[PDB]
Amino acid sequence: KVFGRCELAAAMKRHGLDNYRGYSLGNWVCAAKFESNFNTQATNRNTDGSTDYGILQINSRWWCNDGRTPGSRNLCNIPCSALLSSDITASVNCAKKIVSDGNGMNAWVAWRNRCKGTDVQAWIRGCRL
Ligand SMILES: [Cl-]
Ligand SMILES: [Cl-]
Ligand SMILES: [Cl-]
Ligand SMILES: [Cl-]
Ligand SMILES: [Cl-]
């Protein structure tokens, strides 16, 4: 599924991500924009053989099982394919664990490089939330 901006913001809020670990909804929408362009089915292989999955490009090196990332963990206790669903529940639950791991949203390099410090409220501007 390719979400619209306000549609994703609403879904994220519905799933408790709004201000989770102190990160406002716009931060999460911005991260999703630059990780996946709002596409739940986005996958991208990393140079090291892991793959990033879904709306928030969650990495198989630590967070989900894809069966082809030797030496890796599955800390979200989910198959990586669950992170590709139209329903964002699995991605949100796993993102909550990632953002709690110590470095906040800096875990998402694209958030650090493209969202951090910016006017992230623009991402929820106009949305009926
Ligand atoms: Cl947009
Ligand atoms: Cl915001
Ligand atoms: Cl594996
Ligand atoms: Cl959803
Ligand atoms: Cl933080």
Tab-separated table of C-alpha atoms in Angstrom, residues 6-117:
chain	number	residue	atom	x	y	z
A	6	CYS	CA	-2.281	12.532	6.324
A	7	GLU	CA	-3.581	8.965	5.954
A	8	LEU	CA	-0.268	7.633	7.351
A	9	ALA	CA	-0.222	10.219	10.090
A	10	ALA	CA	-3.679	9.075	11.165
A	11	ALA	CA	-2.664	5.415	11.081
A	12	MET	CA	0.468	6.140	13.091
A	13	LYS	CA	-1.549	8.046	15.675
A	14	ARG	CA	-4.138	5.229	15.809
A	15	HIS	CA	-1.247	2.843	16.639
A	16	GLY	CA	0.237	5.009	19.442
A	17	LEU	CA	3.256	6.412	17.643
A	18	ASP	CA	2.274	10.110	18.169
A	19	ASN	CA	4.859	11.366	20.712
A	20	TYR	CA	6.176	7.886	21.369
A	21	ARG	CA	9.529	8.240	23.157
A	22	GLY	CA	8.967	12.007	22.758
A	23	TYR	CA	8.970	11.956	18.950
A	24	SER	CA	6.125	13.927	17.493
A	25	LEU	CA	3.977	12.533	14.739
A	26	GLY	CA	5.704	14.681	12.092
A	27	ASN	CA	9.046	13.002	12.896
A	28	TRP	CA	7.545	9.594	12.187
A	29	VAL	CA	5.833	10.728	8.965
A	30	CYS	CA	9.034	12.353	7.779
A	31	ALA	CA	10.996	9.204	8.534
A	32	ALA	CA	8.538	7.096	6.584
A	33	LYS	CA	8.595	9.552	3.675
A	34	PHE	CA	12.324	9.261	3.221
A	35	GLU	CA	12.672	5.580	4.155
A	36	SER	CA	9.899	4.212	1.945
A	37	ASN	CA	8.046	7.077	0.224
A	38	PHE	CA	5.073	5.808	2.207
A	39	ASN	CA	5.115	2.374	0.462
A	40	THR	CA	4.471	-0.515	2.808
A	41	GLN	CA	6.041	-2.968	0.316
A	42	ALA	CA	9.442	-1.195	0.028
A	43	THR	CA	12.478	-3.492	0.388
A	44	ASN	CA	16.146	-2.576	-0.021
A	45	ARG	CA	19.220	-4.779	0.253
A	46	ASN	CA	22.182	-3.465	2.220
A	47	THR	CA	25.771	-3.995	1.113
A	48	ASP	CA	26.338	-6.360	4.032
A	49	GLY	CA	23.584	-8.769	2.986
A	50	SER	CA	20.846	-7.614	5.356
A	51	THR	CA	17.634	-6.129	3.965
A	52	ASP	CA	15.432	-3.249	5.109
A	53	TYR	CA	11.677	-3.837	5.083
A	54	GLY	CA	8.520	-1.755	4.921
A	55	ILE	CA	7.243	1.712	5.611
A	56	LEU	CA	10.105	2.330	8.112
A	57	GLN	CA	12.802	0.204	6.460
A	58	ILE	CA	13.436	-2.051	9.407
A	59	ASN	CA	16.683	-4.001	9.056
A	60	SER	CA	17.009	-7.806	9.161
A	61	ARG	CA	20.503	-7.496	10.784
A	62	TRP	CA	18.767	-7.005	14.198
A	63	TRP	CA	15.000	-6.717	14.112
A	64	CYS	CA	13.240	-9.313	11.936
A	65	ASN	CA	13.865	-12.720	10.478
A	66	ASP	CA	14.249	-13.117	6.701
A	67	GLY	CA	16.250	-16.386	6.734
A	68	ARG	CA	19.116	-14.952	4.699
A	69	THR	CA	20.962	-12.633	7.037
A	70	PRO	CA	23.709	-14.838	8.583
A	71	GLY	CA	24.699	-13.915	12.093
A	72	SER	CA	21.720	-11.687	12.592
A	73	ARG	CA	19.068	-11.341	15.277
A	74	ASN	CA	15.213	-11.073	15.304
A	75	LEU	CA	14.544	-8.741	18.246
A	76	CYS	CA	11.021	-7.868	17.101
A	77	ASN	CA	10.197	-11.609	16.934
A	78	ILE	CA	8.607	-11.324	13.518
A	79	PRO	CA	9.202	-12.456	9.992
A	80	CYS	CA	10.419	-9.542	7.936
A	81	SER	CA	7.519	-10.127	5.512
A	82	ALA	CA	5.107	-8.996	8.287
A	83	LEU	CA	6.704	-5.573	7.958
A	84	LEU	CA	5.381	-5.320	4.373
A	85	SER	CA	1.651	-5.551	5.179
A	86	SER	CA	-0.984	-2.910	4.347
A	87	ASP	CA	-1.743	-2.766	8.062
A	88	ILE	CA	1.133	-1.008	9.778
A	89	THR	CA	0.738	-2.650	13.237
A	90	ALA	CA	3.809	-4.892	12.988
A	91	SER	CA	6.027	-2.073	11.689
A	92	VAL	CA	4.816	0.259	14.455
A	93	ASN	CA	5.316	-2.308	17.242
A	94	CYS	CA	8.802	-3.017	15.992
A	95	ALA	CA	9.670	0.675	15.502
A	96	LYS	CA	8.661	1.282	19.123
A	97	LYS	CA	11.316	-1.263	20.184
A	98	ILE	CA	13.934	0.258	17.842
A	99	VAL	CA	13.377	3.834	19.031
A	100	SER	CA	13.652	2.609	22.624
A	101	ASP	CA	17.057	0.937	22.036
A	102	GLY	CA	19.178	3.929	23.125
A	103	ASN	CA	19.760	6.291	20.178
A	104	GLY	CA	16.199	7.334	19.610
A	105	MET	CA	15.297	8.022	16.011
A	106	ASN	CA	18.947	8.251	14.966
A	107	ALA	CA	18.561	4.496	14.311
A	108	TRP	CA	16.972	5.616	11.038
A	109	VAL	CA	19.849	7.164	9.193
A	110	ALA	CA	17.470	8.902	6.749
A	111	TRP	CA	15.654	10.495	9.716
A	112	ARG	CA	18.969	11.791	11.052
A	113	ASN	CA	20.093	13.058	7.626
A	114	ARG	CA	16.778	14.473	6.342
A	115	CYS	CA	14.316	15.022	9.190
A	116	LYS	CA	16.251	15.734	12.392
A	117	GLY	CA	16.149	19.410	13.250
